[PDB]
Design an enzyme around this catalytic site. Structure first.
Site, short mmCIF file in Angstrom:
data_model
loop_
_atom_site.label_atom_id
_atom_site.label_comp_id
_atom_site.label_asym_id
_atom_site.label_seq_id
_atom_site.Cartn_x
_atom_site.Cartn_y
_atom_site.Cartn_z
N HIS A 67 0.81 -1.24 0.00
CA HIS A 67 0.00 0.00 0.00
C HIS A 67 0.83 1.28 0.00
O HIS A 67 0.31 2.34 -0.36
CB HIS A 67 -1.07 0.02 1.12
CG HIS A 67 -0.53 0.34 2.47
ND1 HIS A 67 -0.23 -0.64 3.36
CD2 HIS A 67 -0.24 1.54 3.02
CE1 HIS A 67 0.20 -0.03 4.45
NE2 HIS A 67 0.22 1.29 4.28
N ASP A 119 -0.66 -7.53 1.54
CA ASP A 119 -0.02 -6.21 1.61
C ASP A 119 1.49 -6.43 1.80
O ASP A 119 2.04 -6.34 2.89
CB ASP A 119 -0.63 -5.38 2.77
CG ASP A 119 -0.26 -3.93 2.70
OD1 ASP A 119 0.32 -3.51 1.67
OD2 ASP A 119 -0.56 -3.20 3.66
N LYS A 175 -12.79 -10.85 16.35
CA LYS A 175 -13.80 -10.27 17.25
C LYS A 175 -13.67 -8.74 17.30
O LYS A 175 -14.67 -8.06 17.47
CB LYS A 175 -13.63 -10.80 18.69
CG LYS A 175 -14.17 -12.20 18.91
CD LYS A 175 -14.10 -12.57 20.40
CE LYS A 175 -13.68 -14.01 20.63
NZ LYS A 175 -14.65 -15.00 20.08
N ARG A 176 -12.44 -8.21 17.18
CA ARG A 176 -12.16 -6.77 17.25
C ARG A 176 -12.43 -6.01 15.96
O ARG A 176 -12.58 -4.79 15.99
CB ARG A 176 -10.70 -6.51 17.69
CG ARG A 176 -10.28 -7.13 19.03
CD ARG A 176 -11.14 -6.70 20.19
NE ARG A 176 -10.84 -7.48 21.39
CZ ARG A 176 -11.76 -7.99 22.20
NH1 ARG A 176 -13.05 -7.80 21.96
NH2 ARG A 176 -11.40 -8.68 23.27
N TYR A 177 -12.52 -6.74 14.83
CA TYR A 177 -12.75 -6.15 13.50
C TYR A 177 -13.98 -6.79 12.84
O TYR A 177 -13.88 -7.45 11.80
CB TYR A 177 -11.45 -6.27 12.65
CG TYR A 177 -10.40 -5.26 13.08
CD1 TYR A 177 -10.51 -3.92 12.72
CD2 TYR A 177 -9.29 -5.65 13.84
CE1 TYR A 177 -9.54 -2.99 13.09
CE2 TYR A 177 -8.30 -4.72 14.19
CZ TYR A 177 -8.44 -3.39 13.83
OH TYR A 177 -7.54 -2.43 14.22
N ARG A 178 -15.14 -6.59 13.47
CA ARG A 178 -16.44 -7.15 13.08
C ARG A 178 -16.76 -7.14 11.55
O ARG A 178 -17.18 -8.17 11.00
CB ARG A 178 -17.59 -6.47 13.85
CG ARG A 178 -18.91 -7.22 13.80
N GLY A 197 2.92 6.59 8.86
CA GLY A 197 4.35 6.69 8.58
C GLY A 197 5.13 5.45 9.01
O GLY A 197 6.29 5.28 8.62
N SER A 217 3.92 2.26 8.42
CA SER A 217 3.62 1.12 7.54
C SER A 217 4.80 0.70 6.68
O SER A 217 5.66 1.50 6.31
CB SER A 217 2.36 1.35 6.71
OG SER A 217 2.44 2.53 5.93
N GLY A 218 4.85 -0.61 6.42
CA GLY A 218 5.92 -1.20 5.64
C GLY A 218 7.08 -1.62 6.53
O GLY A 218 7.91 -2.43 6.12
C1 LIG Z 1 7.37 14.65 6.11
O1 LIG Z 1 6.90 13.43 5.48
C2 LIG Z 1 5.67 13.04 5.83
O2 LIG Z 1 4.90 13.72 6.47
N1 LIG Z 1 5.43 11.79 5.35
C3 LIG Z 1 4.28 10.99 5.56
C4 LIG Z 1 3.25 11.36 6.43
C5 LIG Z 1 2.15 10.55 6.60
C6 LIG Z 1 2.01 9.36 5.88
C7 LIG Z 1 3.03 8.99 4.98
C8 LIG Z 1 4.16 9.79 4.85
N2 LIG Z 1 2.89 7.82 4.17
C9 LIG Z 1 1.88 7.53 3.29
O3 LIG Z 1 0.94 8.29 3.08
C10 LIG Z 1 1.96 6.17 2.64
C11 LIG Z 1 1.35 6.24 1.24
C12 LIG Z 1 1.37 4.98 3.43
C13 LIG Z 1 -0.14 5.04 3.73
C14 LIG Z 1 -0.68 4.38 5.04
C15 LIG Z 1 -0.03 4.85 6.35
N3 LIG Z 1 -0.47 4.09 7.54
C16 LIG Z 1 -1.87 3.71 7.75
C17 LIG Z 1 -1.96 2.42 8.56
C18 LIG Z 1 -1.06 2.40 9.74
C19 LIG Z 1 -1.38 1.50 10.89
C20 LIG Z 1 -2.10 1.94 12.00
F1 LIG Z 1 -2.62 3.18 11.98
C21 LIG Z 1 -2.30 1.17 13.13
C22 LIG Z 1 -1.77 -0.12 13.17
C23 LIG Z 1 -1.07 -0.60 12.09
CL1 LIG Z 1 -0.38 -2.20 12.11
C24 LIG Z 1 -0.90 0.20 10.97
F2 LIG Z 1 -0.27 -0.33 9.91
C25 LIG Z 1 0.11 3.05 9.65
C26 LIG Z 1 0.50 3.80 8.46
O4 LIG Z 1 1.67 4.16 8.31
C27 LIG Z 1 -0.18 6.33 6.44
C28 LIG Z 1 0.95 7.13 6.30
C29 LIG Z 1 0.81 8.50 6.14
C30 LIG Z 1 -0.48 9.03 6.18
C31 LIG Z 1 -1.55 8.17 6.36
N4 LIG Z 1 -1.43 6.84 6.49
#
Ligand SMILES: COC(=O)Nc1ccc2c(c1)NC(=O)[C@H](C)CCC[C@H](N1CCC(c3c(F)ccc(Cl)c3F)=CC1=O)c1cc-2ccn1
Length: 238
Positions: free
Chosen positions: A44, A93, A160-163, A186, A188-189
């Site tokens: 993702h 993913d 159970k937590r993600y119905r 930030g 993720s991955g």
């Molecule tokens: C100054 O440089 C910045 O400012 N960079 C910056 C800032 C914000 C983001 C990103 C970069 N990267 C993205 O947009 C990419 C494209 C990834 C998209 C998904 C990401 N997620 C969503 C889910 C998640 C999660 C959780 F929440 C709980 C538990 C668990 Cl196990 C998880 F995996 C963690 C998570 O990293 C995410 C990253 C950003 C913004 C929004 N979402």
């Protein structure tokens, strides 16, 4: 990372920061070194990434402030996304980055072992999530790599937590019932690293969750052991 603490330099030497240079340079996602030209990360992360030319992989980094125009990095030759991937919430993913040059291993950067197919039945009790992500819902990317120790949750309890979702055996969940510690935007991955018999194993890839560190909402991770054959198919091709 919500509810974590600063990591010590060299603590997570497989952890990388993946940056995009388009439109401007910024941290995009975490990743893990698994081989000398291979980074394992989340599919993702690449939403809207049209080319590997805009990517830069930085290894051996504790603080994002170590990164300037003169900081060395690895170019990305190829982005390999699992063919069944549609979205994080539906699984698959997982992605591999093939680097343009080889990572020289040392005390600041080295690979993490993949879990053993024979270790599908082992119970991990020392698991940690790391990254430069938000420490709260509305925040910014952190300078210092953070860490948080989180317990694994069974598939039955996570379901159970993600119905309204389908939590599959290709997913692994981690979190406290009361919340407080989790990955956030930030992170993720990045890895979910578990220490078993004095060896660190890459058990999960940070993937998704409902908000961050909420009570009864564990983090959902790609269950790496279920993709060992896919990783070898892509990295050990004849
Ligand atoms: C100054 O440089 C910045 O400012 N960079 C910056 C800032 C914000 C983001 C990103 C970069 N990267 C993205 O947009 C990419 C494209 C990834 C998209 C998904 C990401 N997620 C969503 C889910 C998640 C999660 C959780 F929440 C709980 C538990 C668990 Cl196990 C998880 F995996 C963690 C998570 O990293 C995410 C990253 C950003 C913004 C929004 N979402």
């Amino acid at each position: 990372i919500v509810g974590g603490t600063a990591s010590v330099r060299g603590e997570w030497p497989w952890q990388v920061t993946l940056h995009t240079t388009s439109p401007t340079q910024r941290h995009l996602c975490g990743g893990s070194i698994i081989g000398n030209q291979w980074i394992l990360t989340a599919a993702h992360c690449f939403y809207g990434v049209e080319s590997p030319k805009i990517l830069r992989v930085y290894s051996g980094i504790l603080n994002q402030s170590e990164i300037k125009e003169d900081t060395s990095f690895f170019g990305v030759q190829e982005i390999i996304i699992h063919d069944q991937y549609k979205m994080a919430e539906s699984g698959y993913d997982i992605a591999l980055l093939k680097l343009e040059t080889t990572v020289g291993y040392g005390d600041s950067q080295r690979p993490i072992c993949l879990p053993s197919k024979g270790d599908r039945n082992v119970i991990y009790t020392d698991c940690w999530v790391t990254g430069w992500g938000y420490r709260k819902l509305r925040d910014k990317i952190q300078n210092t790599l953070q860490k948080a120790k989180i317990p694994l949750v069974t598939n039955e309890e996570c379901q159970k937590r993600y119905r309204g979702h389908k939590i599959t055996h290709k997913m692994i969940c981690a979190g406290y019932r009361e919340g407080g510690k989790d990955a956030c935007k930030g992170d993720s991955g990045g890895p979910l690293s578990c220490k078993h018999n004095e060896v660190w194993h890459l058990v999960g890839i940070t993937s998704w969750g409902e908000g961050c560190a909420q009570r009864e909402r564990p983090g959902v991770y790609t269950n790496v052991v279920e993709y060992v054959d896919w990783i070898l198919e892509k990295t050990q091709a004849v």
